[PDB]
Design a binder for these strands. Structure first.
Lengths: 38, 142, 176, 59, 209
RNA sequence: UGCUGAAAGCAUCUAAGCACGAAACUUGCCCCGAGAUGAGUUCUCCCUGACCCUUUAAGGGUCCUGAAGGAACGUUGAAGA
RNA sequence: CGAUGUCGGCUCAUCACAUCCUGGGGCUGAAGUAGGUCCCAAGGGUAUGGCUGUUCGCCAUUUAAAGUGGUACGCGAGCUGGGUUUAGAACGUCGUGAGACAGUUCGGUCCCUAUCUGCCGUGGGCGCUGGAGAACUGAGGGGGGCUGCUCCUAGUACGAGA
RNA sequence: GUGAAGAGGGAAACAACCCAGACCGCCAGCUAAGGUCCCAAAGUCAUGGUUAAGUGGGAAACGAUGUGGGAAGGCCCAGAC
C-alpha cells in the first residue's frame, strides 16, 4: 500500500473516492492494489 | 496644550452588563475593550481609564460554534519538565468560559502599569449566581 | 448545488405542524415524531414543500439540500419505515435481544451490550438478521454502528458483524 | 494626544476622523485646525454642531 | 464517612501458623468529643470537629472558650476536621468511637512521619559516597552534577538536593482491621504506619461495593 | 473506525448534524495552594469616654485610663545552626 | 591567539522523535502463531564480567530494549589525569650536520573567601482596613505514570493437523 | 550606487536594502516610501478583481472530477451527463 501523495492511474479496476480530505482507493479484482492516503 | 485633568477620587462608575448570546470573540473583545479604556463618551484617555464598568455575568454563550471552536492552543509555561500546557478553544471554554474572553480582552488592551489597572476593572463574573441585586447593572448593546 | 432548488410533496393522510417552533409529524407508521428548529426554513403555502435559509441563523442555504434529506426520512419514518441492513454471520456467533436491551456473542470478553436510546425497538428475527425500528434514520444507523464495534469479518473466512452492503469479499488461495 | 477626544466624538456622530476633517477642508477658506478642536471639553454640543456641519459640507 | 483519632501505642508481631510473623500496630482511641458540626452557609457542605483531650481548664482564652461552649471547652491534643457526607444520621449527642469500624475491614491512616529534618544527599536523596581512596578532591558527598553547562543559563525546578525529610502527612493504604473493642475504645491494625511510637494517628474507613 | 448527508441527483468519516478511540491529554489519587494583590469563608471573643484649636464634614492637639488578645518569664522538648 | 581545558574513566542532567522496549493498530508473498514492512506516540524504561590510555573493536552471560540525535557530538569556578599536548631519559629511521621523522615508549601539575541571575529550607513586614482568636475553601502548581514471572478463560479462535 | 566619512522616514529588531541627501528653530502647513481592527497616530473608506482557507501566516519535483475565465469539438432541451 504505502503512505503516498500520488494517486495517478495504476489499475483500471480501482474505485476511487475522496474521504476526510484524502483520496482512498480500493480494487475488487486485481491483487494488492489499495490506497488509504493521497 | 493642557485643557483638562483627571480626579481619581470622584465617583462615576455605574455598571453595565452585556449578553454574550450571538457575540463573536474579536467583536466582544474589541467592543468591550474600547468601552473599558474609554473612547466613546468621556475621553481622557490616554491619561487614565475612563470606563464606567462594563461586565459579563454569563460568559459561555458566545457564538463560536461553526468555525474555529476546534482552534487555538492557549499555551502556558509552568517552569517544569511537563513542557507548555495546550488547550483548544472547545477545552478552554468548557473548564473556565470566562478565560477565553478575559485573554481576548487583555489581547485588546495596552501593557504596563495603566494597562494592568484596566484589567483590574474587567471584573467578569463566574458560577451562574445572582450577586448584582444592589449593583443593578443596566443591559448595554454592542 | 442541485437539490434545494426542487420541491417535495406532502403525502395524503400525513399530518404536520410546521409554521412555528418544533416541527411535529404523524402518519401510518409513526406518531408524535418531533424535531427542534435549525438554520433551514420550509415553505408550506402549497401541497409541495421547498427549503431555504431560516432567518436568525447562519449558512443555512448550503444546508437546505441536507434538511430536505432529513425531512424526507422523517416522513418515511412515519409512513413506511426504513431498510434493514445489519447482520452477524458465522457459526458459534449470535445476537440476543430483550426488546429492549441487546447483546452480541462474538468471541470477546467485552460486554458488547446496548441498553437502546428512547423510542428505539430492536429485533433479531433469524440466526443472522438484526433489525432496528424508530423514526430517526440516523439513530437506527448509529445503534447499528455501536453493534459494529468488534469482530470485523476477514477476507479468509468472512465471520463477524457485517452490513448487507460491502467493499470486501472472501478470496481463497488468492494470487500471488 | 488631542486626537483622543476628537476621533472618539466623530465616531459617535456617524463619520470617520479622516472624512470629518476633510469636510472642514471642503468648506473652503474657513478656519479649522487640530489645536482648535477642543470646544468639546467645555461643552460637547459645540463639537456636535461642527460634526453635523462637516457631514453636510463633505458632499 | 468522616474520620477518627487515637495514639500509636506500638507495634508487636502476632505470629501465624503458615507464616509470616506479621507486625500489628495498636491504636489507643480517645473519646472524640464531636465539638462542632458545620452547616448553615458552610460552602454547601457539612464537616465535624473531633477534639482529642481536655488539656487544662486554667490555660483557656475567651475566643476559644466561646467557640467551644456549644459542647464545653476541652480542645486538647488536636481538633481535626472530617467531611460529613452520606452519613444518614446526625453525629451530635454521643462521642465517636471505634464503632465507626464495627463492619469495615479496610482503612487509610495519615501517619505523620517522625521528623528527620537534618536530611543530606545520602540520608534523603539516596546517593552514594564517592572514592575514599585512589584520588578525589572535595566531591565525596554530592548529588552528582546539578545542571548541564552553558545553554540553560539557570537551575531546574524539582532537583534531588536539599530540603527536609520526615514530618510529611504520609498516608498508608495497605492495612487491615485485626480487632475492634467499642467498650475499651481500642483498635488493632495489620502492618506498619508512619509516625513514632507514642504519636497521634488519623484514620478513616475505606469502602467499595 | 463510523452513523446520518450536501458540494459531485452516484459516491463520500464532514460541509450542517450525531457516535466511538491510545502507555498520550486532563482529572481522581498524594501533597501543596488566596501575594488567587483576581489579597477567599464561617464561627467565636471584646470595646457604648470626654475636652480644646484652626474653624471644619478636613486636619492637629489634650486629658482620662484600657477590653478581647499578644508579648515577657520559666522547666525544657519527640523542635531547631 | 592579554590564554574558549582535549581524548578516555567516574558522577549526574535537559529537549527532540528520524521508536530499541512499553500502548495503539494498517499493508503483506497476513489462514492461525509468526516473520517482512508501515506510522499515531517520547508519558515510563533502555545491563553486567574480562582485554586496552581508551571511544572504535572483540569475547562470555543477562534483557520488555541492550534506540538515534541536539545541547562546544550535554555535566573540569565537576571528580580522575593513563593517551595526546612540558623540562629528563630510551629505542628504530633520514641527513655532512645542528636538526628532522604518516616510526614508538618510561616519569610527568588540574587552582578558586560564592557578588549578581538561579536553586533549597527558614525568619520578618505590608495586605484584605475597629481590634483579636480557632479552623477550613480551591483559581492554580507539583508529585504519580513503563515493566519481569505464573495461572484461569482454553488447547478457545484459525487450522486435518502441526 | 551606498556604508568607509550619512544623520532622518520605512524594512519586527537591520550598515550596506527601500524613501530622501539634514545651515538652526515653528505646542505651523503639504507630501514620499511605508501605513490606517487592537497593541500603536490615521479609511474596519468608495468601487472593481480573486481564492474558500487559519489559505493569507516556511516549502520542491509529484499527484487528485478543488475550481472561475478563454477558443473549438461532441452530446444538448420532440429532450444531454
Amino acid at each position: 500500500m504505502k503512505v503516498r501523495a500520488s494517486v495517478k492511474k495504476l489499475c483500471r479496476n480501482c474505485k476511487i473516492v475522496k474521504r476526510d480530505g484524502v483520496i482512498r482507493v480500493i480494487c475488487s479484482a486485481e491483487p494488492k492494489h489499495k490506497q488509504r492516503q493521497g | 496644550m493642557k485643557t483638562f485633568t483627571a480626579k481619581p477620587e470622584t465617583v462615576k462608575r455605574d455598571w453595565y452588563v452585556v449578553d454574550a448570546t450571538g457575540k463573536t470573540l474579536g467583536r466582544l473583545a474589541t467592543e468591550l475593550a474600547r468601552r473599558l479604556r474609554g473612547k466613546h463618551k468621556a475621553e481622557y484617555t490616554p491619561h487614565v481609564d475612563t470606563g464606567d464598568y462594563i461586565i459579563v455575568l454569563n460568559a459561555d454563550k458566545v457564538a463560536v460554534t461553526g468555525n474555529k471552536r476546534t482552534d487555538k492552543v492557549y499555551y502556558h509555561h509552568t517552569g517544569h519538565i511537563g513542557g507548555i500546557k495546550q488547550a483548544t478553544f472547545e477545552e478552554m471554554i468548557a473548564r473556565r468560559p470566562e478565560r477565553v474572553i478575559e485573554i481576548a480582552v487583555k489581547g485588546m488592551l495596552p501593557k504596563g502599569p495603566l494597562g494592568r489597572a484596566m484589567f483590574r476593572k474587567l471584573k467578569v463574573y463566574a458560577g451562574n449566581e445572582h450577586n448584582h441585586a444592589a449593583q443593578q447593572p443596566q443591559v448595554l448593546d454592542i | 448545488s442541485r437539490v434545494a432548488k426542487a420541491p417535495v410533496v406532502v403525502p395524503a393522510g400525513v399530518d404536520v405542524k410546521i409554521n412555528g417552533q418544533v416541527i411535529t409529524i404523524k402518519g401510518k407508521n409513526g406518531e408524535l415524531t418531533r424535531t427542534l428548529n435549525d438554520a433551514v426554513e420550509v415553505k408550506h403555502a402549497d401541497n409541495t414543500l421547498t427549503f431555504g435559509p431560516r432567518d436568525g441563523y447562519a449558512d443555512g442555504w448550503a444546508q437546505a439540500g441536507t434538511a430536505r434529506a432529513l425531512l424526507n426520512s422523517m416522513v418515511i419514518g412515519v409512513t413506511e419505515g426504513f431498510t434493514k441492513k445489519l447482520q452477524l454471520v458465522g457459526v458459534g456467533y449470535r445476537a440476543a435481544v430483550k426488546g429492549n436491551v441487546i447483546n452480541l456473542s462474538l468471541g470477546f470478553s467485552h460486554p458488547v451490550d446496548h441498553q437502546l436510546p428512547a423510542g428505539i425497538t430492536a429485533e433479531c428475527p433469524t440466526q443472522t438478521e438484526i433489525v432496528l425500528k424508530g423514526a430517526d434514520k440516523q439513530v437506527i444507523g448509529q445503534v447499528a454502528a455501536d453493534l459494529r464495534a468488534y469482530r470485523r469479518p476477514e477476507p479468509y473466512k468472512g465471520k463477524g458483524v457485517r452490513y448487507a452492503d460491502e467493499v470486501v469479499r472472501t478470496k481463497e488461495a488468492k494470487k500471488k | 494626544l488631542w486626537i483622543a477626544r476628537i476621533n472618539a466624538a466623530a465616531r459617535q456622530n456617524g463619520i470617520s476622523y479622516s472624512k470629518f476633517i476633510n469636510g472642514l477642508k471642503k468648506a473652503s477658506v474657513e478656519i479649522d485646525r487640530k489645536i482648535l478642536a477642543d470646544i468639546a471639553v467645555f461643552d460637547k454640543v459645540a463639537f456636535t454642531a461642527l460634526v453635523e456641519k462637516a457631514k453636510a459640507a463633505l458632499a | 464517612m468522616i474520620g477518627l483519632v487515637g495514639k500509636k501505642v506500638g507495634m508487636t508481631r502476632i505470629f501465624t501458623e503458615d507464616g509470616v510473623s506479621i507486625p500489628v500496630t495498636v491504636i489507643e482511641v480517645e473519646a472524640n468529643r464531636v465539638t462542632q458540626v458545620k452547616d448553615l452557609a458552610n460552602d454547601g457542605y457539612r464537616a465535624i470537629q473531633v477534639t482529642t483531650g481536655a488539656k487544662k481548664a486554667n490555660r483557656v482564652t475567651k475566643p476559644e472558650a466561646g467557640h467551644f461552649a456549644k459542647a464545653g471547652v476541652e480542645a486538647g491534643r488536636g481538633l481535626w476536621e472530617f467531611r460529613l457526607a452520606e452519613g444518614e444520621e446526625f453525629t451530635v449527642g454521643q462521642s465517636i468511637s471505634v464503632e465507626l469500624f464495627a463492619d469495615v475491614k479496610k482503612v487509610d491512616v495519615t501517619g505523620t512521619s517522625k521528623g528527620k529534618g537534618f536530611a543530606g544527599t545520602v540520608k534523603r536523596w539516596n546517593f552514594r559516597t564517592q572514592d575514599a581512596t585512589h584520588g578525589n578532591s572535595l566531591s565525596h558527598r554530592v548529588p552528582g552534577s546539578i545542571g548541564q553547562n552553558q545553554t540553560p543559563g539557570k537551575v531546574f525546578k524539582g532537583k534531588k538536593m536539599a530540603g527536609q525529610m520526615g514530618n510529611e502527612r504520609v498516608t498508608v493504604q495497605s492495612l487491615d482491621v485485626v480487632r475492634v473493642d467499642a467498650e475499651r475504645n481500642l483498635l488493632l491494625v495489620k502492618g506498619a504506619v508512619p509516625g513514632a511510637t507514642g504519636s497521634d494517628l488519623i484514620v478513616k474507613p475505606a469502602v467499595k461495593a
